[PDB]
Design an enzyme around this catalytic site. Structure first.
Site, short mmCIF file in Angstrom:
data_model
loop_
_atom_site.label_atom_id
_atom_site.label_comp_id
_atom_site.label_asym_id
_atom_site.label_seq_id
_atom_site.Cartn_x
_atom_site.Cartn_y
_atom_site.Cartn_z
N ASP A 17 16.86 -44.39 70.98
CA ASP A 17 15.61 -43.62 70.65
C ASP A 17 15.64 -41.95 69.96
OD1 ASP A 17 12.78 -41.74 70.92
OD2 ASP A 17 14.28 -41.00 72.46
N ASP A 19 14.14 -38.41 69.33
CA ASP A 19 13.59 -37.29 69.75
C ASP A 19 14.08 -36.93 70.96
OD1 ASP A 19 12.44 -34.73 68.89
OD2 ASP A 19 11.06 -35.59 69.50
N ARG A 131 -1.35 -44.88 62.39
CA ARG A 131 -0.90 -45.36 61.86
C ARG A 131 0.36 -46.85 61.73
NH1 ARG A 131 1.42 -41.98 67.70
NH2 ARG A 131 0.06 -40.07 66.75
N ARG A 142 -6.41 -34.20 68.20
CA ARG A 142 -5.46 -32.91 67.84
C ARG A 142 -4.94 -31.75 66.70
NH1 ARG A 142 -1.11 -37.02 69.65
NH2 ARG A 142 0.37 -34.99 69.21
N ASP A 223 14.92 -40.88 76.16
CA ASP A 223 14.76 -39.57 77.03
C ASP A 223 13.16 -40.18 77.61
OD1 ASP A 223 13.72 -39.18 74.68
OD2 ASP A 223 12.77 -37.33 75.67
MG LIG Z 1 12.59 -39.50 72.71
#
Ligand SMILES: [Mg+2]
Ligand SMILES: [Cl-]
Ligand SMILES: [Mg+2]
Lengths: 261, 260
Positions: A17, A19, A131, A142, A223
């Site tokens: 991943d 980020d 997207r 947003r 994460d």
């Molecule tokens: Mg991440």
């Protein structure tokens, strides 16, 4: 460097991943991580899989001298709806292609009307972000400030705005074959079922027909590996050995243990 | 360095950003930054642009250089946001001016209108909420470069933007809003007077800070014709307006203007 069939640790790929896995939250990758990835890359295949587009990974992982596609054997922006193998693009599809313009407009129009009719303390802008492999949908929008997002989150905890809208969409569009994922403070994602991070595994599996390499050990690091997180499905998938990380320091520690590095 | 010590007294140069200082939504050149810095040893300099600070930071600054360090006055959002020597100035905002309830009337109407609108293509980012305005795009700002070009041609023929502006004027006739159709895919909606002339209040207020009274106010912009967003600040009798075709033309005129 070496061809994929020549890596000494056979049948093995590490997928990361981006980020808060390879990079600190809202920062670029460190030199220490790049060094460790390059060492890892002499032993086995490496790749990344991230929600955002290539330009974002180029900012987080690449530089003016180095194209991010040079740093990984496999690059999977947009959950793998875009894909690169050793710098070369793989054939890809997109959300708009899969659903079609007409159905996409039905979806968008419904969402716009829903938001017009929705009663909220505050509305802003950027209610729908388009997207390549999904849309992101936010009732407040947003363009909400930091503090407006905090306020919306608490309001949504109490009033279930996102949950009720997801349910409304499922009832309006029951044959559209979409998955809805509520994440973060202000929004939810909408994409075709299967277009989560597990989508990239098709490219890993297809390597069998290119170099002959059959990836039977597929390490995944992320994460957000808890139910509802963006790494949950790829972590839980029986094809992967999932590794849950708290951040890039934790990623480095686990990698060093995992491969004696 | 202090504004009162600049040798060319009572003088400030204000620049539009897109296609005046930089190519539209791309990075400033080193030659322009060098020229701006030279100019800054003679007189006050500032910029005034429609977009938010983050955009100016990406076009004019870097990771090592904050854009607010490069100009005496920074006026993102036509001056609804403002910096003087790196310090934020007191400001108002569109949401403060209109209020939540009327803002929702506006935005709901726009959203409903778009839900009813038939178009070849829709994307995302139909309404962008800013500090000084909203920007409204029937195709949406997430439209690619190519989709924007295509929408513009479609809109030339079908008057999508014009009819929606007319619809808004009909629904909200006493709102005190101005509508400006600009570029390929969108139009702006903002309180009347919140054009680029808005920033001049900050320039005028300098008299009560340093004592400097800006009586020579040069303005440079590329959309100085009626309907362009530099038209009002160009035409205003407080300014010496300079019309530019692009950043090369800006540099040429500046060099002539100030012997640089
Ligand atoms: Mg991440
Ligand atoms: Cl939107
Ligand atoms: Mg301009």
């Amino acid at each position: 460097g070496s061809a994929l069939q020549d890596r000494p640790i056979k049948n093995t790929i590490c997928l990361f991943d981006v980020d808060e896995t390879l990079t600190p939250a809202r920062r670029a990758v460190t030199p220490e991580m790049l060094m460790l990835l390059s060492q890892l890359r002499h032993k086995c295949a490496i790749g990344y899989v991230g929600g955002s587009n290539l330009a974002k990974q180029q900012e987080q992982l690449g530089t003016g001298a180095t194209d991010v596609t040079s740093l990984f054997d496999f690059c999977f922006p947009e959950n793998g709806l875009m894909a690169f193998r050793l710098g070369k693009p793989l054939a890809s599809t997109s959300f708009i292609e899969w659903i079609g313009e007409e159905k996409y407009q039905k979806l968008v129009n419904f969402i716009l009307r829903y938001f017009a009719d929705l009663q909220l303390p505050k509305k802003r802008g950027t209610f729908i972000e388009f997207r390549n492999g999904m849309i992101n949908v936010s009732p407040i929008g947003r363009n909400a400030s930091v503090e407006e997002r905090n306020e919306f989150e608490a309001y949504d905890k109490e009033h279930h705005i996102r949950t009720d809208m997801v349910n409304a969409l499922k009832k309006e569009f029951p044959d559209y074959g979409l998955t809805y994922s509520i994440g973060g403070q202000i929004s939810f994602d909408v994409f075709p079922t299967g277009w989560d991070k597990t989508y990239c595994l098709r490219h890993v599996e297809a390597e069998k027909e290119i170099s002959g390499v059959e990836y039977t050990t597929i390490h995944f690091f992320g994460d957000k590996c808890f139910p509802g997180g963006n790494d949950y499905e790829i972590y839980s998938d029986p094809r992967t050995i999932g590794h849950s990380v708290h951040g890039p320091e934790d990623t480095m520690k686990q990698l060093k243990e995992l491969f004696q590095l």
